[PDB]
Amino acid sequence: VPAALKRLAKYVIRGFYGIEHALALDILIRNSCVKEEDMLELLKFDRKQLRSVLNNLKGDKFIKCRMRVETAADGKTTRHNYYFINYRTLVNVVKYKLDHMRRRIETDERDSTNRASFKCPVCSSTFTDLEANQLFDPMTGTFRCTFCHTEVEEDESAMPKKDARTLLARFNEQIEPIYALLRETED
Amino acid sequence: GYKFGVLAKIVNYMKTRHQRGDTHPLTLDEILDETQHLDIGLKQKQWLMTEALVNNPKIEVIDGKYAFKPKYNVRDKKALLRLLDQHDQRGLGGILLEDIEEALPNSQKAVKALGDQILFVNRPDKKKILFFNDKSCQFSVDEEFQKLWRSVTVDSMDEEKIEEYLKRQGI
Amino acid sequence: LRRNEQNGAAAHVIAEDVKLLQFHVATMVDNELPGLPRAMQKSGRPLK
Amino acid sequence: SGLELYAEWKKILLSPERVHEIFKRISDEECFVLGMEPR
Ligand SMILES: [Zn+2]
């Protein structure tokens, strides 16, 4: 297990997940496979507390679990859950998770591009510049709302575009350390 | 009361006796006098002497006497930091905040002094678990980005789609 | 459910909420569901 | 079971989103075979 894999996993886990996920992952990093009961006693977490965290790790498939069945010394059946980290799925899921942001970020940019500009101040309804001309009243010579028979505003549509764009831009700037770690771990 | 009451008073008196600052080791007979249990059975005396006073994790035999293990108890910032560090290094896990506050009165002074070096995990019962903050690999993001991450679904995909998205866009 | 998702509520809570939504949707289409309570109008009259 | 589905080989809950994903992938030919007019 190259250290680059461990660094990437630790960076993404501490970057976008809580310390509970990071601590659990560090256990799976320190030891390739650890039993759920061992992780439970070590982390001192409750069953549902750890299970939900593990379910999250199961959700992103960053870790794999295998079930072992054996008979205890007293004759009772025992079913132990052995968890281990799957760097292949982890790197694949983060690559999707990150390239999905790019799709979502560009979707948000396309939204900032498509967010209708005109709007009615009475009913707080937003109208598209294509619909605004449909809603234009020649008698008044200005845009109005059919339901409210009131003036339609247009200038307030810049504020949400500007604000959201700052978040979108700052997201791309901060994500670069993980992208560098990915380029270092593509092999 | 004869069986458990006497031994319980031994523990309760000895535990409280330490809170007085008398860290010097004590004998069972001295505690029996202070607890007024001089009439405890001969077999009970030796039983407490040979088992109860040695098997407890907080009592240590020193020159034939019993002590509160001042080194084991957490009563300072350095002990708290080192214990969390060593526990994290060995993968032992966290320690409950109540274990430190009960060991060190007003542990908040030590906790606030370490600050971000202590990671606090809140249990469903509001109890806090303390963990060492190993600063080897760190990364943090804005709430908007943490919210964006939560918004992107990952579990509702098959291995085909998980890999297809990569080649679909070009990686 | 929207707020639970936006707030990132617990999976079991969200699951129960979806299970409740599933029951409401099903009951609205058909009140004659097997193994499920008849939806009353708070007065002993079953909803149509 | 009740109003929800299980898959068993060994058992999992089968969600409507996962069924939606599976169904969205079904081709026109499979719909014709299934007797469903895709349009
Ligand atoms: Zn209006």
Residue A10 forms contact with B (CB below 8 Å): yes
Query: Cβ distance A142 to A136 under 8 Å?
Result: yes
> CB count, 10 Å around CB of B123?
14
Helix, strand or coil, per DSSP, at residue A143: strand
Does the distance separating the beta carbons of C19 and D4 come in below 8 Å? Answer: yes
Residue D36 to residue D39: CA distance in whole angstroms: 9
Query: Cβ distance B139 to A178 under 8 Å?
Result: yes
Chosen from C5, C12, C14 to mutate, greatest number of chain A CBs within 10 A: C12
Count chain B–chain D contacts defined by CB atoms under 8 A: 7
Q: What is the resolution of this structure in A?
A: 4.1
- Taking alpha carbons only, the member of B135, B13, B128, B28 closest to residue A26 is B135
Residue B106 forms contact with D (CB below 8 Å): no
Residue C8 forms contact with A (CB below 8 Å): no
Does the distance separating the beta carbons of C23 and D3 come in below 8 Å? Answer: yes
Length of chain C, please? Answer: 48
Query: Which of A10, A44, A93 is facing B162, going by the closest CB pair?
Result: A93
Residue B121 to residue B141: CA distance in whole angstroms: 19
Q: Domain residues of chain B, as ranges?
A: 4-75, 76-133, 134-168
Spell out which residues of chain C touch residue A48, defining contact as CB-CB under 8 Å: 12
| Annotated binding-site positions of A for Zn(2+) | 120, 123, 145, 148
Method: cryo-EM
- Taking alpha carbons only, the member of A147, A141, A98, A101 closest to residue A127 is A147
Residue B118 to residue C4: CA distance in whole angstroms: 30
Query: Which of A23, A31, A49 is facing B124, going by the closest CB pair?
Result: A49
Chain D closest CA to B156's CA: distance in Å?
6
D in contact with A (at least 3 C-beta pairs within 8 A): no
Dihedral angle computed from the Cα positions of residues A159, A160, A163 and A165, in that order, rounded to the nearest 10 degrees = -120
Outline where DSSP puts E strands in A59-153.
Answer: 63-71, 77-85, 118-120, 125-127, 136-137, 142-145, 150-151
Paired tokens of B83: 């214990």
From chain D residues 1-20, the ones with a CB under 8 A of any chain B CB are 15, 17-18
Residue A127 alpha carbon to ligand 1 centre in Å: 10
B125, amino acid identity: D
**Per-position b or e across C5-25, b if 16+ CB within 10 A of its CB:** eeeeeeeeeeeebbeeeebee
Provide the 8-state DSSP code for A153: B
B in contact with D (at least 3 C-beta pairs within 8 A): yes
First to last CA, chain B: 75
Chosen from B158, B159, B165 to mutate, greatest number of chain D CBs within 10 A: B158
CA A58 and chain centroid, separation:
15
Question: Looking at the DSSP assignment, which residues form a beta bridge with residue A143?
Answer: A136
Chain D closest CA to B154's CA: distance in Å?
12
Residue A37 to residue C6: CA distance in whole angstroms: 32
- Taking alpha carbons only, the member of A56, A59, A29 closest to residue A45 is A56
Residue B62 to residue B26: CA distance in whole angstroms: 10
Element (H, E) at C29: helix C11-29
